[PDB]
Write a protein that binds this ligand. Structure first.
Ligand SMILES: [Ca+2]
Ligand SMILES: [Ca+2]
Lengths: 243, 243, 243, 243
């Protein structure tokens, strides 16, 4: 089992659009032990389900919008995993998601929050030379925040790399989810990108979770600063031809 | 075992600089069955070693400089793997490597040869919806051929993707090899890139073989058209600071 | 004269690091008529100098940190240039420039403010099919905002392009300025990038102003969505060799 | 006049698809003096027209497929411009344009030929610190050669930059030409890219010639290693929406 005895903080299971569930599943499946976070005791029920399914070591409240909340969270993770001979974290997964305030809010929750976790997790990640992984999704001021987030990956890979901490991102294609499906205008992106993308389909959540597993695993120990597109080739694509 | 019963043509073991050995090792290690090629009955000895170590199903002469040689090779692979109920190939690995003739020769051996294998392997790759993987290395007219090769990855991912064939590349950092080491001027790139790269080291061959395994494996089934840098973050790096 | 009778709002002359002065100079030199903005009646003196040197049609207070300030500014520009048979603007130049608040503030002033001007200027820019130009500079959370800003260029080029409005950016290399010079640690970037860059020098402000002129001029009428590096080749550069 | 007394070798007027004509026109218009080349005394008539229209200082046979032909050409240009107090060249314009042989041929004529001219022109370009400009066009093994050519721009900018020689490329959008128009399948790219591109049109030859003028002119003296897209924003574009 690829991750026997390895420890991962997974943040974002509260959202049905995040793919964090599939990442947790992929990680669990290979023997990792997981601590999952919930942003709000209002949105805790889905996380408890995962906790249940995945044998979560703990379930800790973390709102990635506030440094203090993050600090408290990491104080708690430190209690579980920041003691012992074999103290430390193998990975931290960040899988979260107009006026200036809309922009400000996008950048804060989507982009800065990743730097915020990296800071809070550095000591523990350093202890086991673990990695950070963020997700990005493929139209608004979320384009600006996407770009922002991907730039933090390069800065962080460079600033954390001296401690042996890898930092990487997956860029996920459009995925067909329930509910996401019943929008009828998101439905229509999926219809189109299925025809656009080289593989002529949309990626599954399983494909994203397995790519995430890879980046978080020993197999990816030579890889840092990377944006891995998991999108059936959508991003690389070129011209309509007859559409 | 991730690749139980999966079939991979690995081309380039003849070169001590290719990393093809480590890729074969990584693949074997996870239960794949391998057919390795040699460019010349003059350079067959190293391949026979690998054949030996890896239990190669066959060892077939292929000079990636000639379409006919490639055709013959694929006629032979067809005999082993192009018959049965479960006919087909899971992957083909292309891990090969001033006047206009030097440029012409670089482009031919380094870049076009990859398209040449894709063509020859399409039917078999289609049969099992398998993938193609090429390697690129990180200064000459090899820069031009690198760029050429990476562009073929996007074209091929797009042209082959309708058949369910994925097409991807790894871009490998400077690696410290024996002999490669005793050059004393390549030695010095390695010295520098170790200080440059975020992780403060050069990647190992193991790291490249495992990243290759990943891209060739079911875990990467949502990924096509990708250039995966395996280089300890070298490529992403930004400014000297105090060097 | 390339810009006879053309109208340009230039924002950022208040900063001695912005290069907005040189852009204004370049524009004036070719016959454009200019309205320059100042963020604060505290920082108005430098702008009045330029107003003086360049024959500014007006000098209007604009703080790019507030939508209302921007609105008022554009109400005023509308009074000068939003009436007549030949109403409209030929260009708008945006040449402006750790905790989450530092990030928030960088993104707001550096990145969103550009979208804010585009919105406020759209009607007038549309009237003459004019363009927007922003500047970017080449290490902090300013990397994240840089990336953010450059992504707004693509979104805006796409959203404004149906009205015939072009949207482009210059990315400026390290420039040797007075004061900027007397920092002794910025001094040292300049020393290094002079040795790094292909041309073996740093670009002048004149070189940036002339590239800006170009992008704002009829000569660039086929160009939108572009990031033009004006940096003596610094960005494109590859490996130390012997440093 | 921006180019009074400046000297430019323009190669590619023989082709009706090259846009070299418009570049020559743009250059002439600003007072440059031109030497135009023809690949073949069979395809000399169009060049003589331009020679006529533009007051060409000479008209010299150059087949960019052969080093010797290029050498002879440059021996001749040396006779006109490689003597005097003010010896040298202000610019050289390279505006030229399946089996392995098709690939080999694409790379040779499209990509290496640019390096070949740079070599032959270096001494003269150095003498006046002039620049090189190549064109690229926007599906075959021409994609591979495009990528190849753009990589030569970075290598050459870096290798020639110590002599004060700038090296840049324009990437031109689909242009509606006569004849090119009467193809009925190229016609249809133009129809589509007009709807795709942000500006909702295809660029003109005038727009490409003026962008070329810029890069070759003193205004672009801070710019090297650049790929300038002149394509009404086509390249930057993102997703169909409702097509
Ligand atoms: Ca990548
Ligand atoms: Ca560019």
């Amino acid at each position: 089992m690829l991750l026997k005895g390895q420890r991962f903080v997974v943040t974002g299971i509260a959202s049905k659009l995040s793919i964090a569930w599939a990442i947790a599943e992929s990680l669990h499946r290979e023997g990792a032990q997981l601590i999952l976070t919930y942003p709000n005791d209002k949105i805790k029920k889905r996380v408890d389900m995962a906790a249940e399914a995945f044998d979560a070591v703990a379930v800790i409240e973390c709102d990635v919008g506030s440094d203090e909340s993050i600090q408290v969270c990491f104080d708690e993770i430190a209690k579980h995993w920041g003691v012992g001979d074999d103290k430390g974290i193998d990975g931290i997964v960040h899988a979260i998601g107009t006026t200036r305030e809309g922009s400000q809010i996008a950048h804060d929750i989507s982009s800065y929050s990743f730097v915020a976790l990296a800071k809070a997790g550095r000591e523990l990640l350093a202890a086991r030379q673990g990695s950070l992984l963020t997700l990005t999704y493929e139209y608004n001021v979320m384009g600006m925040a996407k770009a922002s987030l991907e730039a933090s990956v390069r800065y962080l890979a460079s600033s954390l790399g001296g401690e042996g901490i890898r930092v990487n991102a997956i860029s996920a294609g459009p995925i067909r989810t329930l509910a996401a499906s019943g929008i009828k205008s998101f439905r229509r992106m999926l219809d189109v990108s299925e025809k656009i993308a080289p593989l002529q389909r949309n990626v599954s959540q399983e494909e994203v979770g397995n790519a995430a597993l890879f980046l978080l695993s020993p197999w990816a120990s030579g890889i840092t600063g990377e944006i891995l597109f998991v999108d059936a080739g959508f991003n690389t694509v070129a011209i309509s031809e007859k559409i």
